[model samples]
Target: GSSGSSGPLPNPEGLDSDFLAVLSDYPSPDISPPIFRRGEKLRVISDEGGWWKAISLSTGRESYIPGICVARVSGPSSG
Candidate 1:
């Protein structure tokens, strides 16, 4: 099942919302969708070199994303 296949995702901490934009209404800024909480689950939709196309796990909406926004939590991996 999809449930078991997906393990408990890592929750990395202290990710600054420095350059991130905060979405108040339906659609927000063009760069960084709001201040994402640390350890938030994100999915890669597309990639343009260092940039990315992803949706927030919390919000589940499409946004212009960046690879820097994602951080590996556990397992053998490197960003």
Candidate 2:
């Protein structure tokens, strides 16, 4: 009998959204992705546990970022 492991990683927080705004900068010299600066926009492609898979709108690069590092985009409000 051959069996393959199958199951989605549990996301306890269940936090999901499409687009998010970068609130801080994350500069890394690794072979992952470019740095993310404050006031930047990211298009969330997927969610993995506490991290979210995103694409930078500025450079069009894909990368994973901590969920706590981003905030959901909101509509403009008049003062």
Candidate 3:
């Protein structure tokens, strides 16, 4: 078809591929989980009620944090 170009046009509305980056610092809990620092990238596992369940990209530890503490990163962050 005429619509078919060389490959395909980039779809901006596609599934979210961006990961979450901590904008604020979060202290480790009593369990001594890896503390999340500012600008640390997290692999988002779930999002509910302005809270996100994410995993640390450095230590692979999962935890929940407030959504306001993070921002969507289009690419990898300097974590």
Candidate 4:
């Protein structure tokens, strides 16, 4: 096996792992979700109310995405 590709993520370890969006398309305009495939990952900046404010690894820009879109990738379970 190899290390990995598609660029290096910020959260190298678990707990704060990169998040994956389902890309179902936002039904509203208040939160312009980052346009990327569900297979891609986003670096979470903020989370709450079943929504996520993360930065896109592709554009390196910030945007809001639905919480349900994520694949349950999160931060450390233990210290």
| Candidate 1 deviant stretches above 4 angstroms | 1-35, 72-79
For residues 11-70, what per-residue lDDT tens digits would candidate 2 score against the true structure? 445775478788766644455344577778898889888888887879877877887788
Please give the CA lDDT of all the candidate structures.
0.51, 0.75, 0.75, 0.63
Clashes of 1: 1
Model 4: per-residue lDDT, tens digit, 1-79?
A: 9876787765656674456554554434466543645655677778778877876577676767787765655544689
**Number of colliding residue pairs in model 4:** 4
lDDT of 3: 0.75
In candidate 3, how many Å is residue 9 off? 28
Scored by TM-score, the top model is 2
Model 2 global lDDT (CA atoms, 0 to 1)? 0.75
**What is candidate 1's lDDT per residue for 1-79, written digit by digit as tens?**
4555665646445542222332232123675446444555555557688875666668776765555556533333565
All candidates in order of TM-score, best leading: 2, 3, 4, 1
Q: Give the TM-score of candidate 3.
A: 0.61
Instruction: Summarize candidate 3's per-residue lDDT along 1-79 as a digit string, tens digits.
Output: 5675486665456776548888877754655544678888887788787887998778777888887778887764578
